[model samples]
Target: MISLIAALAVDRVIGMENAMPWNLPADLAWFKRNTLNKPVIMGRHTWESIGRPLPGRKNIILSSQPGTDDRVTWVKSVDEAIAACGDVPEIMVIGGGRVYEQFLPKAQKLYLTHIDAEVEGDTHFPDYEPDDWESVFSEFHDADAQNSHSYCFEILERR
Candidate 1:
């Protein structure tokens, strides 16, 4: 099964200048726990941003444009990536914008770390109606972050 996991701001803002604007330690811990042992899917740029293959899970890189490095399993499409992950119960789609836009519809579950704060960003998360999703669970974190931003960890399912 394909799953989408990301952290974003209230305005659907995901990143500023190709990097995440906020740093939430609690949320990062949540992400690490959820994706640790599972195979992760992403585009070339996202992999580049990460700098290297993530240690535990298999990193599947999805991109139409090929000619990549050794660690990357470069596939031409999403279906090909899915094929590579055969029988894997859950796969994480980690991203940059274009990759999420193409894969979000195929995802069965969503793990969104929603931050209340907003900042300047060149890229944003894809638009989706909240009514189409059911908020199965959520927990708000400390907003009194002093110099940092406050956020919530939300688990949503397709309704």
Candidate 2:
């Protein structure tokens, strides 16, 4: 299975300045716990933003650039990454911006943490209209309980 996990603002904004605007420790913990032993595929920029490979997970970084570290495996395209992860039981698509837009159409599941507040942001999730997706499962969390921030989890699948 391929899964995407992102924290979006009320306006469906994902990031600002290549980084997340809000800090929610619970969301991060949820991400880490779920993806820890899985294959994580991301674009080069997203991989760069993190600066290092996440421990216990296989990191496949896709980019036109030809470079890689021990923890990071660089690929030129999405097909290549998919080929690598195809046999795995589960794989994660961590992001930047364009990466998500390109892969969302092909992803099987979306794990989103939708924040209640909106903030000015440069990066946003691609518009996913109701016709395109159906909420298969959803769990609401008190933003206050998640952290100092406000957000809830929505799991969707292509309709």
Candidate 3:
């Protein structure tokens, strides 16, 4: 299965300056919980922003550039990225703006986190038709000391 997971602020804002706009540990943990032990495909900028390869999963990065270390596998295109994750039971499509848009149509389900407030951001998650997705799970979290934003999590399967 191909799953696309993301956290969006108002207007589908996903990132600014190549990193998340807010500090939400709860959402971060939720992401890890859902994507752990699976092959995660992401764009080069996303991998670069993350600093190091994530632990316990295959980091498959889609990049035109070469010279990646053994910690991750860099594929030249989305087609190659998909093929690289084929042997795995499931694959998670992580993103850097355009990457999410590129994979949206191919995703089987979506794990989305919607933040309550808006922030200045240059990168946005692409919009999709609501009629194409069916909700499976949802939960809301209140902002606290550890989390700067109140957010709601939604799991939607493609229909």
Candidate 4:
């Protein structure tokens, strides 16, 4: 199965300046919970932003200008990365903007954290047809003294 995971503000904002616009620990933990031990595919910029190879998963990077790395396997394109998954039970599309856009249509499941407020950001999650997916799970979180943003974690499966 191929899954696309992202956290976007109400305006669909995902990132700015190569980093997440907000600090939501719970949301970050949610991401790790879903992606841990899976094959993670990401674009070059996304890999650079992460700064280190994520532990417990095969790091597959999509890059045109590739080099040797003990931590990651470089692929020329998304297709190549997907093919590399082979018999892996799940592959997570962990991203930068362009990577998410490229994989959105092909994703079997989407794990999205929808923030309650709009945010100013340069990178946005690509819009998809709502009719094409159905939510299988959803949990809402209220903003508290600890969490700055109110959000909902939703797991949607392609219909």
Candidate 2 is scored at a TM of 0.90
Report the lDDT tens digits of candidate 1 across residue range 1-159: 788899999788888776787877787788889899898888877787777888788889976787478775778788888888778889899887888898889878889988988688887778977888899989987766542777888988988
lDDT of 4 at 75: 92
> How close is every model to the real structure, measured as TM-score?
0.92, 0.90, 0.96, 0.94
Worst 10 residues of 4 by lDDT: 63-72
Per-residue lDDT of candidate 4, residues 82-110 (tens digit): 99877988899998789998998889999
Q: Rank by TM-score, descending?
A: 3, 4, 1, 2
Q: Best candidate per TM-score, number? A: 3
Instruction: Give a tens-digit lDDT track for model 3, residues 68-103.
Output: 777899899889999988787779998978899899
| Candidate 4: stretches off by over 4 Å | none
Q: Give the least accurate 10-residue stretch of model 2, judged by summed lDDT.
A: 142-151
Clashing pairs in 2: none
Task: Name every residue pair that clashes in candidate 1.
Answer: none
In order of lDDT, best first, we have 3, 4, 1, 2
Model 2, C-alpha of 48: deviation from truth (Å): 1.8
State the local distance difference test value for candidate 3: 0.90
lDDT of each: 0.83, 0.80, 0.90, 0.88
Tens digits of lDDT, candidate 2, 26-113: 8888789878989898888778778888989888999897876865788888889888775888778888678888788778888888
Clashes of each: 0, 0, 0, 0
Every model: Cα RMSD to truth = 1.7, 1.7, 1.0, 1.2
Q: For this target, which candidate reaches the highest lDDT against the unseen true structure?
A: 3
